[PDB]
Design a protein around this ligand. Sequence first.
Ligand code: CLA
Ligand code: CLA
Ligand SMILES: CCCCCCCCCCCCCCCC(=O)OC[C@H](CO[C@H]1O[C@H](CS(=O)(=O)O)[C@@H](O)[C@H](O)[C@H]1O)OC(=O)CCCCCCCCCCCCCCC
Ligand SMILES: CCCCCCCCCCCCCCCC(=O)OC[C@H](COP(=O)(O)OC[C@@H](O)CO)OC(=O)CCCCCCCCCCCCCCC
Ligand SMILES: CC1=C(/C=C/C(C)=C/C=C/C(C)=C/C=C/C=C(C)/C=C/C=C(C)/C=C/C2=C(C)CCCC2(C)C)C(C)(C)CCC1
Lengths: 50, 96
Amino acid sequence: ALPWYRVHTVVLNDPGRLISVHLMHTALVAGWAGSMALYELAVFDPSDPV
Amino acid sequence: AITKSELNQLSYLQVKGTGLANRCSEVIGEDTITPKSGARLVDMCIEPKAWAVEEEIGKAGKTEKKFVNSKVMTRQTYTLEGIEGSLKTDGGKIVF
Ligand code: CLA
Ligand code: CLA
Ligand SMILES: CCCCCCCCCCCCCCCC(=O)OC[C@H](CO[C@H]1O[C@H](CS(=O)(=O)O)[C@@H](O)[C@H](O)[C@H]1O)OC(=O)CCCCCCCCCCCCCCC
Ligand SMILES: CCCCCCCCCCCCCCCC(=O)OC[C@H](COP(=O)(O)OC[C@@H](O)CO)OC(=O)CCCCCCCCCCCCCCC
Ligand SMILES: CC1=C(/C=C/C(C)=C/C=C/C(C)=C/C=C/C=C(C)/C=C/C=C(C)/C=C/C2=C(C)CCCC2(C)C)C(C)(C)CCC1
């Protein structure tokens, strides 16, 4: 019944699953930070800091 | 243990595994010798205790050739032992 731009409104009146979805955004953000740091550390040249 | 005289007072069984076999001995005194004629240095032991490699480093907006410290990747297998030579006097100086 819902269109494609209203799908994520099923947790509007569900306090238990709002916490879950906000936790999911949190986990994705933390994973991105960790993986980006790991990828950056493998292409960095620390020989000349000048 | 620390000197050769009391190192010769130990077994191979009670020295094996401890790491003392890679150590150099220590002397005790302040006398003079003056080698006779036809003498030979024998039993010489050389033990390194610090290693460095020359390379480029940067302090503050500058670079200079500096010796940087390094860590040995192998184990206690780096001391020379049993070196022998023949002493002589050229003009008042000793040559090995
Ligand atoms: C008095 C205690 C208390 C505490 C400490 C918090 C703390 C928090 N609440 Mg909150 N909340 C409270 C009472 C409290 N609230 C009450 C009374 C209500 C009404 C029911 C809510 C309703 C509420 C909602 C609806 C939401 C929050 C969310 C959050 C978190 C947002 C920041 C975040 O995700 O950090 C990032 C998290 C960390 C860095 C992790 C920190 C370590 C955690 C806390 C260890 C968890 C162990 C513990 C047993 C879990 C239960 C404790 C829980 C109460 C925190 C934050 C940890 C949001 C959330 O969960 O988003 C994810 C959210 O959406 N709260
Ligand atoms: C302050 C920081 C911040 C804020 C406010 C948000 C807010 C949001 N993030 Mg998130 N995110 C952040 C940091 C943040 N993020 C970081 C640091 C990362 C790691 C890189 C992510 C990774 C991330 C993922 C992986 C996902 C989100 C999603 C979401 C949205 C979920 C709510 C929703 O349904 O919106 C409804 C959606 C909209 C209103 C659309 C917003 C469109 C944005 C603002 C611009 C579009 C980007 C770009 C122009 C592409 C358009 C082209 C396209 C047509 C092809 C919400 C807008 C989810 C999402 O958007 O899925 C729907 C999702 O899947 N985030
Ligand atoms: C899980 C991670 C989440 C995000 C975390 C942060 C990002 C992690 C790193 C991602 C890097 C991907 C881009 C690399 C940069 C680039 O494009 O330019 C660098 C090179 C330049 O090309 C070529 O050119 C260069 C010069 S030459 O070829 O030698 O002449 C050469 O150096 C290079 O090797 C060669 O490829 O690009 C590529 O050839 C790499 C191809 C892509 C590498 C694999 C991507 C893996 C994606 C799979 C998962 C998809 C996920 C989809 C959604 C779920
Ligand atoms: C891992 C992630 C991979 C996926 C990432 C993101 C995927 C998201 C893609 C979704 C975008 C799709 C939107 C289409 C969906 C679509 O358009 O549906 C049209 C939709 C119809 O609305 P209704 O409420 O009638 O919806 C009926 C429902 O059945 C639809 O769900 O209207 C809108 O969405 C309003 C916005 C106007 C949109 C106008 C679009 C035309 C733009 C111009 C086209 C180009 C012109 C070119 C010539 C110049
Ligand atoms: C489970 C588990 C685990 C694991 C974990 C992991 C493995 C994780 C990972 C994670 C990860 C690895 C994550 C990642 C993430 C990422 C992200 C999230 C991304 C995003 C992106 C985006 C969003 C982008 C977009 C864009 C584009 C594409 C283009 C341009 C524009 C933009 C930027 C917007 C462990 C063992 C620890 C523990 C137990 C449990």
